[PDB]
Design a protein around this ligand. Sequence first.
Ligand SMILES: [Cl-]
Ligand SMILES: [Cl-]
Lengths: 135, 135
Amino acid sequence: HMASLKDLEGKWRLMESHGFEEYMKELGVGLALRKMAAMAKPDCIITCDGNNITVKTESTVKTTVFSCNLGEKFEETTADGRKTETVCTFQDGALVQHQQWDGKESTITRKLKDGKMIVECVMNNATCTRVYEKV
Amino acid sequence: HMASLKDLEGKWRLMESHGFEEYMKELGVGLALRKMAAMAKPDCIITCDGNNITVKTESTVKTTVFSCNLGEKFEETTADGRKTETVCTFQDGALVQHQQWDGKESTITRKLKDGKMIVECVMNNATCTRVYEKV
Ligand SMILES: [Cl-]
Ligand SMILES: [Cl-]
Protein backbone atom coordinates (compact mmCIF):
# COMPACT_ATOMS: atom_id res chain seq x y z
CA HIS A 1 0.00 0.00 0.00
CA MET A 2 1.74 3.15 -1.38
CA ALA A 3 0.83 6.55 0.19
CA SER A 4 -1.54 9.12 -1.31
CA LEU A 5 -1.56 12.95 -1.07
CA LYS A 6 -4.70 12.87 1.16
CA ASP A 7 -2.84 10.61 3.61
CA LEU A 8 -0.76 13.70 4.54
CA GLU A 9 -3.82 15.69 5.61
CA GLY A 10 -3.97 16.49 9.35
CA LYS A 11 -2.39 18.18 12.38
CA TRP A 12 1.07 16.77 12.96
CA ARG A 13 3.25 17.27 16.02
CA LEU A 14 7.06 17.10 15.80
CA MET A 15 8.46 14.15 17.75
CA GLU A 16 12.06 13.65 16.60
CA SER A 17 14.75 15.71 14.89
CA HIS A 18 18.14 14.75 13.39
CA GLY A 19 20.57 17.12 11.68
CA PHE A 20 18.26 20.13 11.87
CA GLU A 21 20.89 22.64 13.10
CA GLU A 22 23.26 21.64 10.27
CA TYR A 23 20.46 22.06 7.72
CA MET A 24 19.51 25.53 8.98
CA LYS A 25 23.26 26.31 8.93
CA GLU A 26 23.50 25.36 5.28
CA LEU A 27 20.49 27.65 4.59
CA GLY A 28 22.18 30.59 6.34
CA VAL A 29 20.00 30.83 9.45
CA GLY A 30 21.83 32.69 12.27
CA LEU A 31 22.57 31.02 15.62
CA ALA A 32 19.72 32.97 17.37
CA LEU A 33 16.96 31.82 14.99
CA ARG A 34 18.46 28.29 14.94
CA LYS A 35 18.24 27.74 18.71
CA MET A 36 14.74 29.29 18.53
CA ALA A 37 13.61 26.95 15.79
CA ALA A 38 15.16 23.93 17.55
CA MET A 39 13.47 24.66 20.90
CA ALA A 40 10.07 24.71 19.16
CA LYS A 41 8.04 21.55 18.73
CA PRO A 42 5.76 22.85 15.94
CA ASP A 43 2.45 21.75 14.60
CA CYS A 44 2.39 21.18 10.86
CA ILE A 45 -1.16 21.33 9.58
CA ILE A 46 -1.61 20.05 6.04
CA THR A 47 -4.81 20.18 3.99
CA CYS A 48 -5.28 18.70 0.51
CA ASP A 49 -8.22 20.15 -1.39
CA GLY A 50 -7.74 18.02 -4.53
CA ASN A 51 -4.33 19.04 -5.89
CA ASN A 52 -4.55 22.32 -3.92
CA ILE A 53 -2.10 21.82 -1.04
CA THR A 54 -1.80 24.07 2.03
CA VAL A 55 0.89 23.61 4.64
CA LYS A 56 0.56 25.65 7.81
CA THR A 57 3.57 25.63 10.13
CA GLU A 58 2.48 26.69 13.63
CA SER A 59 4.64 27.73 16.57
CA THR A 60 4.57 30.21 19.44
CA VAL A 61 7.24 32.19 17.58
CA LYS A 62 5.97 32.34 13.98
CA THR A 63 3.12 30.90 11.93
CA THR A 64 3.95 30.25 8.29
CA VAL A 65 1.53 29.16 5.60
CA PHE A 66 1.75 28.47 1.91
CA SER A 67 -0.93 27.24 -0.44
CA CYS A 68 -0.11 25.89 -3.87
CA ASN A 69 -1.40 23.72 -6.64
CA LEU A 70 0.62 20.58 -7.23
CA GLY A 71 3.14 21.12 -10.06
CA GLU A 72 2.67 24.89 -10.46
CA LYS A 73 5.71 26.96 -9.55
CA PHE A 74 5.00 29.63 -6.90
CA GLU A 75 6.73 32.29 -4.81
CA GLU A 76 7.40 31.26 -1.24
CA THR A 77 8.58 33.33 1.72
CA THR A 78 10.15 30.78 4.07
CA ALA A 79 9.93 30.85 7.86
CA ASP A 80 13.58 32.05 7.93
CA GLY A 81 12.61 34.79 5.46
CA ARG A 82 14.02 33.55 2.17
CA LYS A 83 12.24 34.51 -1.03
CA THR A 84 12.24 31.36 -3.17
CA GLU A 85 10.69 29.87 -6.31
CA THR A 86 9.03 26.61 -5.23
CA VAL A 87 7.28 23.59 -6.88
CA CYS A 88 5.48 20.83 -5.03
CA THR A 89 5.22 17.45 -6.69
CA PHE A 90 3.93 14.08 -5.65
CA GLN A 91 6.50 11.33 -6.29
CA ASP A 92 6.43 7.72 -5.01
CA GLY A 93 4.09 8.41 -2.08
CA ALA A 94 5.98 11.58 -1.07
CA LEU A 95 5.20 15.26 -1.27
CA VAL A 96 8.32 16.81 -2.68
CA GLN A 97 8.89 20.54 -2.20
CA HIS A 98 11.66 22.02 -4.31
CA GLN A 99 12.96 25.51 -3.54
CA GLN A 100 15.30 27.61 -5.64
CA TRP A 101 16.76 31.02 -4.72
CA ASP A 102 20.01 32.78 -5.64
CA GLY A 103 21.03 29.72 -7.67
CA LYS A 104 20.86 27.63 -4.48
CA GLU A 105 18.41 24.74 -4.06
CA SER A 106 16.84 22.72 -1.29
CA THR A 107 14.35 19.88 -1.25
CA ILE A 108 11.89 19.09 1.53
CA THR A 109 10.28 15.65 1.20
CA ARG A 110 7.23 14.69 3.35
CA LYS A 111 6.19 11.06 3.34
CA LEU A 112 4.02 8.72 5.35
CA LYS A 113 6.02 5.89 6.96
CA ASP A 114 4.43 3.54 9.45
CA GLY A 115 1.71 6.06 10.39
CA LYS A 116 4.31 8.81 10.90
CA MET A 117 5.10 11.72 8.69
CA ILE A 118 8.82 11.73 7.88
CA VAL A 119 10.20 15.12 6.74
CA GLU A 120 13.56 14.91 4.88
CA CYS A 121 15.34 18.20 4.15
CA VAL A 122 18.34 18.28 1.83
CA MET A 123 20.57 21.19 1.03
CA ASN A 124 23.90 20.36 -0.57
CA ASN A 125 25.74 17.90 1.73
CA ALA A 126 23.42 18.72 4.65
CA THR A 127 20.52 16.40 5.39
CA CYS A 128 17.93 16.40 8.12
CA THR A 129 15.15 14.03 9.17
CA ARG A 130 12.20 15.22 11.23
CA VAL A 131 9.48 12.86 12.45
CA TYR A 132 5.89 13.97 13.07
CA GLU A 133 2.93 12.09 14.61
CA LYS A 134 -0.81 12.66 13.99
CA VAL A 135 -2.59 14.80 16.59
CA HIS B 1 -11.64 54.24 14.62
CA MET B 2 -10.42 53.02 11.17
CA ALA B 3 -10.12 49.23 10.60
CA SER B 4 -6.88 47.22 10.69
CA LEU B 5 -5.85 44.06 8.78
CA LYS B 6 -6.04 41.96 12.00
CA ASP B 7 -9.67 43.06 12.44
CA LEU B 8 -10.49 40.80 9.45
CA GLU B 9 -9.14 37.69 11.18
CA GLY B 10 -11.79 35.06 12.01
CA LYS B 11 -14.48 32.64 10.78
CA TRP B 12 -17.16 34.56 8.93
CA ARG B 13 -20.56 33.26 7.87
CA LEU B 14 -22.38 34.72 4.85
CA MET B 15 -25.60 36.49 5.86
CA GLU B 16 -26.69 38.64 2.90
CA SER B 17 -26.04 38.75 -0.83
CA HIS B 18 -26.89 41.38 -3.49
CA GLY B 19 -26.01 41.18 -7.18
CA PHE B 20 -24.02 37.96 -6.86
CA GLU B 21 -25.55 36.18 -9.89
CA GLU B 22 -24.82 39.20 -12.12
CA TYR B 23 -21.22 39.31 -10.88
CA MET B 24 -20.63 35.59 -11.54
CA LYS B 25 -22.26 36.21 -14.95
CA GLU B 26 -19.77 38.94 -15.76
CA LEU B 27 -16.96 36.53 -14.76
CA GLY B 28 -18.28 33.83 -17.11
CA VAL B 29 -19.56 31.32 -14.56
CA GLY B 30 -22.15 28.96 -16.14
CA LEU B 31 -25.74 28.77 -14.84
CA ALA B 32 -25.05 25.41 -13.06
CA LEU B 33 -22.10 26.68 -10.97
CA ARG B 34 -23.96 29.97 -10.35
CA LYS B 35 -27.03 28.37 -8.74
CA MET B 36 -24.60 26.12 -6.82
CA ALA B 37 -22.58 29.04 -5.52
CA ALA B 38 -25.74 31.00 -4.65
CA MET B 39 -27.32 28.14 -2.67
CA ALA B 40 -24.17 27.92 -0.51
CA LYS B 41 -23.79 29.99 2.63
CA PRO B 42 -19.99 29.69 2.92
CA ASP B 43 -17.58 30.21 5.73
CA CYS B 44 -14.75 32.59 4.95
CA ILE B 45 -11.86 32.00 7.31
CA ILE B 46 -9.22 34.72 7.26
CA THR B 47 -5.90 34.67 9.12
CA CYS B 48 -3.37 37.50 9.23
CA ASP B 49 0.12 36.40 10.23
CA GLY B 50 1.69 39.88 10.01
CA ASN B 51 1.36 40.88 6.35
CA ASN B 52 0.96 37.19 5.41
CA ILE B 53 -2.76 36.86 4.59
CA THR B 54 -4.64 33.58 4.11
CA VAL B 55 -8.25 33.44 2.99
CA LYS B 56 -9.95 30.06 3.15
CA THR B 57 -13.35 29.83 1.46
CA GLU B 58 -15.24 26.82 2.83
CA SER B 59 -18.36 25.15 1.46
CA THR B 60 -19.82 21.67 1.08
CA VAL B 61 -19.07 21.92 -2.64
CA LYS B 62 -15.50 23.27 -2.79
CA THR B 63 -12.87 24.58 -0.39
CA THR B 64 -10.60 27.26 -1.81
CA VAL B 65 -7.56 28.75 -0.13
CA PHE B 66 -4.95 31.30 -1.06
CA SER B 67 -2.11 32.63 1.00
CA CYS B 68 -0.22 35.76 0.01
CA ASN B 69 1.96 38.51 1.35
CA LEU B 70 0.39 41.95 1.19
CA GLY B 71 1.53 43.80 -1.96
CA GLU B 72 3.29 40.87 -3.68
CA LYS B 73 1.67 39.73 -6.90
CA PHE B 74 0.77 36.02 -6.93
CA GLU B 75 -0.93 33.38 -9.06
CA GLU B 76 -4.45 32.54 -7.98
CA THR B 77 -6.75 29.73 -9.10
CA THR B 78 -10.24 31.02 -8.31
CA ALA B 79 -13.13 28.92 -7.03
CA ASP B 80 -14.67 29.10 -10.54
CA GLY B 81 -11.32 27.91 -11.95
CA ARG B 82 -9.82 31.06 -13.42
CA LYS B 83 -6.05 31.41 -13.47
CA THR B 84 -5.35 35.02 -12.47
CA GLU B 85 -2.53 37.34 -11.41
CA THR B 86 -3.58 38.82 -8.06
CA VAL B 87 -2.34 41.51 -5.59
CA CYS B 88 -3.78 42.15 -2.15
CA THR B 89 -3.39 45.60 -0.68
CA PHE B 90 -4.64 47.32 2.43
CA GLN B 91 -6.33 50.64 1.62
CA ASP B 92 -8.46 52.81 3.95
CA GLY B 93 -9.38 49.98 6.33
CA ALA B 94 -10.14 47.56 3.48
CA LEU B 95 -8.41 44.50 2.12
CA VAL B 96 -8.39 45.01 -1.61
CA GLN B 97 -7.87 41.99 -3.86
CA HIS B 98 -7.13 42.81 -7.48
CA GLN B 99 -7.30 40.06 -10.10
CA GLN B 100 -6.15 40.25 -13.70
CA TRP B 101 -6.55 37.54 -16.37
CA ASP B 102 -6.92 37.66 -20.16
CA GLY B 103 -6.79 41.47 -19.98
CA LYS B 104 -9.92 41.40 -17.79
CA GLU B 105 -9.92 42.68 -14.20
CA SER B 106 -11.96 42.33 -11.06
CA THR B 107 -11.64 43.76 -7.58
CA ILE B 108 -12.84 42.15 -4.36
CA THR B 109 -12.86 44.53 -1.38
CA ARG B 110 -13.32 43.19 2.20
CA LYS B 111 -13.93 45.73 4.92
CA LEU B 112 -15.17 45.84 8.48
CA LYS B 113 -18.38 47.87 8.85
CA ASP B 114 -20.31 47.92 12.10
CA GLY B 115 -18.86 44.57 13.24
CA LYS B 116 -19.71 42.96 9.89
CA MET B 117 -17.43 42.07 7.06
CA ILE B 118 -18.69 43.67 3.85
CA VAL B 119 -17.40 42.03 0.64
CA GLU B 120 -17.70 44.23 -2.50
CA CYS B 121 -16.99 42.58 -5.85
CA VAL B 122 -16.64 44.70 -9.00
CA MET B 123 -16.22 43.53 -12.53
CA ASN B 124 -16.92 46.08 -15.23
CA ASN B 125 -20.48 47.41 -14.72
CA ALA B 126 -21.35 44.50 -12.42
CA THR B 127 -21.20 45.01 -8.67
CA CYS B 128 -22.05 42.76 -5.78
CA THR B 129 -22.22 43.20 -2.01
CA ARG B 130 -21.97 40.24 0.35
CA VAL B 131 -22.31 40.60 4.12
CA TYR B 132 -20.61 38.25 6.59
CA GLU B 133 -20.92 37.98 10.39
CA LYS B 134 -18.33 36.66 12.89
CA VAL B 135 -18.81 33.05 13.99
CL1 LIG C 1 4.17 32.79 1.45
CL1 LIG D 1 -4.45 28.89 -5.39
